[PDB]
Amino acid sequence: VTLADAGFIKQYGDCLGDIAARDLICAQKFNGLTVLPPLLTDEMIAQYT
Partner 1 sequence: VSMTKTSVDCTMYICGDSTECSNLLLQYGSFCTQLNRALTGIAVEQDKN
Partner 2 sequence: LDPLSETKCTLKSFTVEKGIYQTSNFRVQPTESIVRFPNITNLCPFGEVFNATRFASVYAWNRKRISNCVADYSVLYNSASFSTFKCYGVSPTKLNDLCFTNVYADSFVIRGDEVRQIAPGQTGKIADYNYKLPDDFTGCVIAWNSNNLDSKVGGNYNYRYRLFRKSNLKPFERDISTEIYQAGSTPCNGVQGFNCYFPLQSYGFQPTNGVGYQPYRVVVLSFELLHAPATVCGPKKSTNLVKNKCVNFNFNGLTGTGVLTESNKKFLPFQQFGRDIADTTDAVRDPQTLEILDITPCSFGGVSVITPGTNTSNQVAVLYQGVNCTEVPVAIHADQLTPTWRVYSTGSNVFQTRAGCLIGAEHVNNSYECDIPIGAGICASYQT
Partner 3 sequence: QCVNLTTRTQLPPAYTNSFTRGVYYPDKVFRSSVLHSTQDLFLPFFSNVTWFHAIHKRFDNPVLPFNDGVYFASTEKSNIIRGWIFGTTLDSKTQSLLIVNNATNVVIKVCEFQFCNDPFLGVYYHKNNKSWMKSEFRVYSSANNCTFEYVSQPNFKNLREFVFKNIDGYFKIYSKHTPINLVRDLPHGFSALEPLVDLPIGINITRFQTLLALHSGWTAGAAAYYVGYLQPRTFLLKYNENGTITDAVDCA
Ligand X SMILES: *[C@@H]1O[C@H](CO)[C@@H](O[C@@H]2O[C@H](CO)[C@@H](O)[C@H](O)[C@H]2NC(C)=O)[C@H](O)[C@H]1NC(C)=O
Q: Which residue, 14 or 44, has its beta carbon nearer to ligand X?
A: 14
Residue 22 binding result from ligand X, partner 3, partner 2, none, given CB thresholds of 5 to 8 Å by partner type: partner 3
Residue 12 binding result from partner 2, partner 1, ligand X, none, given CB thresholds of 5 to 8 Å by partner type: partner 2
Q: Which residue, 3 or 16, has its beta carbon nearer to partner 1?
A: 3
Q: How many CB atoms lie within 10 A of CB 42?
A: 9
Q: Report the C-alpha gap between 22 and 19 in whole angstroms.
A: 6
Residues in contact with 14: Cβ distance below 8 Å, sequence separation at least 6, in sequence order: 26
Question: Of residues 1, 3, 17, 46, which one binds partner 2 by CB under 8 A?
Answer: 17
